[PDB]
């Protein structure tokens, strides 16, 4: 243990889930690469260290221990080499920018209107449960071929997978402190299998243009499909983060705009500013805050720390996006800060494959919301609480408007 960081011994998992920003402010100043005992891992907290680890040839992909316990093998986020190349080739077709531009409007905009019509005349709403999450999961769910899985169920699944994936607390001996916390991830996977296995059975014989059907068939010899055990971990990758994060990003962007009322008004009046508003929202509260990791493949020295080969490092991109070496007053949402790079989509060979898709989902959702409710106001009686260390976002977003 590093002597001057003895205070890290007293950092708790609950503290990191409720608000990691004070601890990580200390880490960025004291130890940009630091071993955090309750996480049982080195953690990268600055922009320079996160970007170096994510792009270095001396590191490769790995899943965090609780993430591996949740997803198994071969999750696209945790593999390398030929397997990673295959899984990337598998997911990339529907995510290509030219392809997304062909159909993204006809996918998301009707979905956004459907959810808006349920509440736009009420004068009040809780936008996370009633809008941001449903639009995010319904859009991706239809793309995948899960049209018949209700948005309520998709939302329950990503919540359970979230809690299992981020069940990272370890004890003195490095063993998981809360092994019972993986049970609901196991239950979610069992439910997912019961729903998706019959769909896969069908797609093997009758391919259609759902993404999962293409995952089974694309690039395969005639009459062959990828085995379902080979693609299920990447299905889980989607059913957690791909389902959850566009909703998180929408909602954090909204919370940030409400915190700057003049900027909210600017964006409602000029919706061409919505992409910039979203980019700042992702930097301000990164949806995938500290879920990603890498592992060294050779001895390497990072931020003054000599690491052996085989050392995992958690990439706390949500902290890197508050690096005061790069941003002025990063805890404040500011639509007007200059367009600078950010790490909310990761970096390197394993950077987010769905960036272009995700940005359009969030853009269209906010466009439709502001057109339907231009006089949106935050219910200042009800507070906005953010939760999560691995994945972070607001747990609710109560709003009102004069009808
Ligand atoms: C605002 C929404 C999203 C954010 C902030 C986000 C962020 C991220 C981050 C931080 C990673 C890990 C990058 C790294 O390890 O360096 C990642 C990986 C990934 N994301 Fe996104 N994501 C979002 C939405 C989506 C969506 C909607 C999809 C699919 C339609 C998607 C597909 C993927 C895939 C396939 C990977 C694994 C890439 C690989 O390991 O090769 N993401 N994402
Ligand atoms: C794109 O979805 C995911 C991304 C990550 C990145 O670390 C972890 C779990 C996920 O489900």
Textual characterization of the structure:
- The protein is of the alpha+beta class.
- It has one domain (1-403).
- The chain is 50% helix and 10% strand.
- It has 15 helices and twelve strands.
- It has helices at residues 13-18, 21-30, 47-55, 65-71, 81-91, 97-117, 127-144, 151-165, 183-205, 211-217, 228-258, 261-269, 274-284, 317-320, 355-372; strands at 33-36, 41-44, 59-62, 124-126, 292-296, 300-302, 305-307, 312-315, 377-378, 386-387, 393-394, 398-400.
- Strands 1-2-8-5-3 form a five-stranded mixed beta sheet, covered by helices on one side. A three-stranded antiparallel beta sheet has the order 4-12-9.
- Helix 7 packs across helix 8 and helix 8 packs across helix 9.
- The protein starts with 12 loop residues before the first helix and ends with a strand.
- Residues 77, 237, 240-242, 288, 291-292 line the site of 4-hydroxy-3-methoxybenzaldehyde (V55).
- The PDB classes it as oxidoreductase.
- The entry lists the keywords Aromatic catabolism, cytochrome P450, lignin valorization, protein engineering, oxidoreductase.
- It forms a monomeric assembly.
- The entry is titled "Crystal structure of GcoA T296A bound to p-vanillin".
- The protein is Aromatic O-demethylase, cytochrome P450 subunit.
Taken as a percent bin, the fraction of beta residues is 5-15%
User: Order of SSEs, N→C?
Assistant: HHEEHEHHHEHHHHHHHEEEEHHEEEE
Number of strands: 12
In terms of structural class, how would the helical and strand content be classed? Answer: alpha+beta
Radius of gyration over alpha carbons?
21 Å
How can the largest sheet be summarized? 5 strands, mixed
Helix content: 40-55%
The total number of structural domains is: 1
- Number of helices, where a helix is a run of at least 4 consecutive DSSP H or I residues: 15
What is the end-to-end distance? 59 Å
The largest sheet has its strands arranged as: 1-2-8-5-3
Which ligands occur here?
Answer: protoporphyrin IX containing FE, 4-hydroxy-3-methoxybenzaldehyde
- Outline type: globular
PDB class: oxidoreductase
Keywords: Aromatic catabolism, lignin valorization, protein engineering, oxidoreductase
Assembly: monomeric
Entry title: Crystal structure of GcoA T296A bound to p-vanillin
């Amino acid at each position: 243990e590093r002597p001057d960081l003895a205070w890290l011994d007293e950092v708790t998992m609950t503290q990191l889930e409720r608000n990691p920003y004070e601890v990580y402010e200390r880490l960025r100043a004291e130890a940009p690469l630091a071993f955090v005992p309750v996480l049982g891992s080195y953690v990268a907290s600055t922009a320079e260290v996160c970007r170096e680890v994510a792009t270095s040839p001396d590191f490769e992909a790995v899943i965090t221990p609780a993430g591996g316990r949740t997803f198994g093998h071969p999750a696209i986020i945790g593999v390398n080499g030929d397997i990673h190349a295959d899984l990337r080739s598998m997911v990339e077709p529907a995510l290509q920018p030219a392809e997304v531009d062909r159909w993204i409007d006809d996918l998301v905009r009707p979905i956004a209107r459907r959810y808006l019509e349920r509440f736009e005349n009420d004068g009040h709403a809780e936008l996370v449960a009633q809008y941001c999450e449903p639009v995010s999961v319904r859009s991706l769910g239809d793309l995948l071929g899960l049209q018949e899985v209700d948005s309520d169920k998709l939302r329950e699944w990503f919540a359970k997978l979230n809690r299992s994936f981020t069940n990272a607390a370890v004890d003195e001996n490095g063993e998981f402190a809360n092994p019972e916390g993986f049970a609901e991830g196991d239950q979610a996977k069992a439910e997912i299998r019961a729903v998706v296995d019959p769909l896969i059975d069908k797609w093997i014989e009758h391919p259609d243009d759902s993404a999962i059907s293409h995952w089974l068939h694309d690039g395969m010899p005639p009459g062959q499909t990828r085995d379902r055990e080979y693609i299920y971990p990447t299905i889980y990758v989607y059913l957690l983060g791909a389902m959850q994060e566009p909703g998180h990003g929408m909602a954090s962007t909204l919370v940030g705009l409400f915190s700057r009322p003049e900027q909210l008004e600017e964006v409602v009046d000029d919706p061409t500013l919505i992409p910039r508003a979203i980019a700042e929202g992702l930097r301000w509260t990164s949806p995938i805050w500290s879920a990603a990791a890498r592992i060294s493949t050779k001895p390497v020295t990072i931020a003054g720390v000599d690491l052996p080969a085989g050392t995992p490092v958690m990439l706390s991109y949500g902290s890197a996006n508050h690096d005061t070496g790069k941003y002025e007053a990063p805890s404040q949402y500011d639509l007007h800060r200059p367009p600078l790079p950010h790490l909310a989509f990761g970096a390197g060979n394993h950077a987010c494959a769905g960036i272009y898709f995700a940005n359009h989902v969030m853009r269209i959702a906010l466009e439709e919301l502001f057109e339907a409710i231009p006089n949106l106001e935050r219910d200042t009686r009800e507070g906005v609480e953010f939760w999560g260390w691995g994945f972070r976002g607001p747990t609710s977003l109560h709003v009102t408007w004069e009808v």
